[PDB]
Write a protein that binds this ligand. Structure first.
Ligand SMILES: O=C(O)[C@H]1O[C@@H](O[C@H]2[C@H](O)[C@H](O)[C@H](O[C@H]3[C@H](O)[C@H](O)[C@@H](O)O[C@@H]3C(=O)O)O[C@@H]2C(=O)O)[C@@H](O)[C@@H](O)[C@@H]1O
Ligand code: NA
Length: 228
């Protein structure tokens, strides 16, 4: 028997501003359904406190997608609209099973391309330095596929305990704070000026696994998004 995330108060504010995509982008449950007790192995309250996401398969997801609050439709904002767009979370990333290679846990996405992904990564070299079992940001600065279109940053090695995140977008600039420490300040987003379809996401989006059955698993102790 699985306990629903909505059975406690902690996540109601974000559930009131999200729909859930599972197991792919086009299959969704509404904010109303989430608030009404949506539950399953993919999305349940673990140990009385964690909004836990689980998903297997290449490019499959169990992921919240930002909505206008209070039964609203899909949100679309812009990096240069003047509003500060802020997402906060506290995440326990447990040990990922063999075959899971990258799990996107927070995003800024849009109708053109992902402006930002925060992901857990098993192993990667960045700017000449090898990192293992760590949290990375990937920012798009163009629409191409080569590495020149991205800025990738080692944010923090994965920790045993909960790790806090804050993503702030204001006036075409991005700041990321992890465990209270700034890890990216003033990253340019101006390529995306005028893109009015941006939105936050969070959960588990399974990227390039080497086994289709390996289940990615991510636990949120807190999640919120706000415009201010
Ligand atoms: O060394 C590198 O940086 C490796 O990057 C690989 O290309 C990445 C690309 O940089 C980026 O991470 C992209 O991200 C996509 C994501 O996985 C999801 O599919 C979706 O969110 O869309 C993202 C996007 O389009 O921005 O994924 C690719 C990738 O293949 O994983 C390769 O170039 C690799 O050879 C290289 O080592
Ligand atoms: Na765990």
């Amino acid at each position: 028997f699985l306990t629903a995330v909505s059975s406690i108060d902690t996540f109601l504010p974000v559930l009131n501003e999200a729909k859930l995509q599972w197991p792919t982008s086009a299959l969704a449950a509404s904010s109303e359904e989430l608030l009404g007790g949506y539950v399953g192995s993919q999305f349940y309250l673990q140990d009385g406190k964690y909004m836990q996401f689980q998903i297997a398969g290449s490019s499959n997801r169990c992921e919240l997608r930002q909505m206008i609050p209070d039964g609203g439709s899909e949100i679309g904002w812009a990096v240069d609209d003047g509003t500060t767009h802020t997402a906060t979370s506290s995440i326990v990333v447990p040990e990922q099973v063999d075959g899971v290679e990258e799990v996107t846990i927070m995003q800024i996405n849009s109708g053109e391309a992902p402006q930002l992904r925060i992901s857990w990564i098993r192993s990667k070299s960045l700017d000449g330095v090898a990192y293992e079992d760590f949290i990375m940001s990937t920012v798009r600065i163009g629409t191409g596929d080569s590495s020149d279109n991205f800025v990738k940053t080692h944010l923090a090695d994965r920790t045993a305990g909960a790790m806090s995140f804050q993503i702030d977008v204001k006036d075409s600039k991005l700041t990321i704070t992890v465990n209270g420490n700034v890890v990216v300040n003033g990253q340019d987003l101006s390529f995306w000026d005028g893109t009015d379809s941006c939105y936050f996401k969070a959960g588990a989006y399974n990227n390039n696994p080497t086994s289709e059955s390996a289940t990615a698993r991510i636990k949120f102790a807190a999640l919120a998004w706000v415009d201010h």
